[PDB]
Amino acid sequence: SCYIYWDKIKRIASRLEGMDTSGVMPLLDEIEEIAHDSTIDFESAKHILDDAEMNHALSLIRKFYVNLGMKLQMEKAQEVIESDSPWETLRSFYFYPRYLELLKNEAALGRFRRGERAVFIGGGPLPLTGILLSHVYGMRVNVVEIEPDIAELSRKVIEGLGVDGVNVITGDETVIDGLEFDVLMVAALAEPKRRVFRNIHRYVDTETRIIYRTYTGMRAILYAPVSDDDITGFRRAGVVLPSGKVNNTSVLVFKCP
Amino acid sequence: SCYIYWDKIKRIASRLEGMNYHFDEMDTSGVMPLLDEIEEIAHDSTIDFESAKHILDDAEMNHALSLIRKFYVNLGMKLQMEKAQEVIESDSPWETLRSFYFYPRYLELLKNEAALGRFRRGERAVFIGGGPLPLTGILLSHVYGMRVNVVEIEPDIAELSRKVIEGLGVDGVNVITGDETVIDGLEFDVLMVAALAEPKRRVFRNIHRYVDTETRIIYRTYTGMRAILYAPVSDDDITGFRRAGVVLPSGKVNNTSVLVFKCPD
């Protein structure tokens, strides 16, 4: 092999090695131009990313991606809380249009209905999907967030927005033991995958629609995919591969029998 | 896991196993139901590539998968032999040709390949792995206007293939008896590798020493649940090449088609 992206990735990584949310946006663009390149097939993608010589470069890019991701969420959270026009400020979040698309295809993958009960594991500072489950899909939502200070901030976001029927529970994935719900979603950044799915397995039954977010193809450059082994005791029952600028693949699983 | 498909597949293989016990020689008419059960699993678009490998790479499935794969190649090769001899005896060769079970699939597959590899009338193609019914090289010439060499390692199979070509009055399709190393001695614009050309590792290593970095190369492989039918070409098999376009099949087409160029130096 001799893919032109091999060198391009290596070069972007050289500029992260020694390393302002606004001022690093062009780095994101460079990385996403490659991730989103639809001429790169899943075999090619895997050839680049699975290669031992690519190991360090992959880790630099992934580190950058989750860091900018988090910082953009933080910043927006606070912005939303301080805003006279919170829903307008929410709408201008860099990733907003993407999340709409994503949750739009998940709603179909998961047959979402008004009044169903959704649980969302890993809400973060800006619980946007939580918010959209209720605001758009009219579901009754519990968002779960492990870090108390982030959970506290996420409540101030929900409250600032005046969204109804979205509550934030401070805790790990085992808080699902005392909940009743129709749909369970697992955030892309919900970690650690192996423990998270072992525990989910304990507290759902075979009818619970479970949706998780992962990364497939060239988009795996952004984050480590949920493995086969991670979803032991489940079966896949539908997948949505992304297009456009949407980065996550959404997978629907059911607990085995 | 707990895919419905797992037991389906196990029962199919059980039937194959009991049948191979009774008869070495396939009864091609008699086994069509079984192909169709296998193709309904292969063609199910509800199954994603990730699950397909969950299913198909499990060590517990290896015995069943091998029996299904041996069936698919043994059936397709017998169907080819039967059709070839029919064509040769027929007073309506084209009509006979057209009734070959997989015929419509090949027209659809070749079309997508024609766009993928930008086939132009007059260009020289070489097809490795011709078989008794050299449908792909026949179409390259009759439909696509290419000047074709078909390579077939088995001399009696190459022989039968020439006779089919003649029977059909097809010009510009020559048949070489040899292995993939005959391509050193040939000029070609495009090179194509039958999904059944074996062994992959050797074939692609000989391709590598005998082509340049400009020559279009197209091979047929199996992806998703269609990999139930035959072992795919691995990324290790194509070291020293880069992928430059893939055509994922729909409908009843079995083959994925991949374009590659040899790497620089």
Ligand SMILES: C[S@@+](CC[C@H](N)C(=O)[O-])C[C@H]1O[C@@H](n2cnc3c(N)ncnc32)[C@H](O)[C@@H]1O
């Ligand atoms: C996943 S993101 C935000 C989620 C998603 N981007 C959204 O807001 O629509 C980051 C958060 O998930 C939380 N998290 C990761 N693993 C968790 C688990 N097992 N249980 C509860 N929260 C978790 C982290 O504290 C982090 O703030």
Ligand SMILES: C[S@@+](CC[C@H](N)C(=O)[O-])C[C@H]1O[C@@H](n2cnc3c(N)ncnc32)[C@H](O)[C@@H]1O
């Ligand atoms: C590949 S199939 C036929 C393909 C199909 N008949 C078509 O036209 O598209 C049959 C042949 O490939 C031949 N074959 C397998 N490996 C080969 C190789 N490395 N070189 C030349 N022939 C090969 C086998 O002997 C077998 O007859």
Ligand SMILES: [Br-]
């Ligand atoms: Br820079």
Ligand SMILES: [Br-]
């Ligand atoms: Br592919």
Ligand SMILES: [Br-]
């Ligand atoms: Br005729």
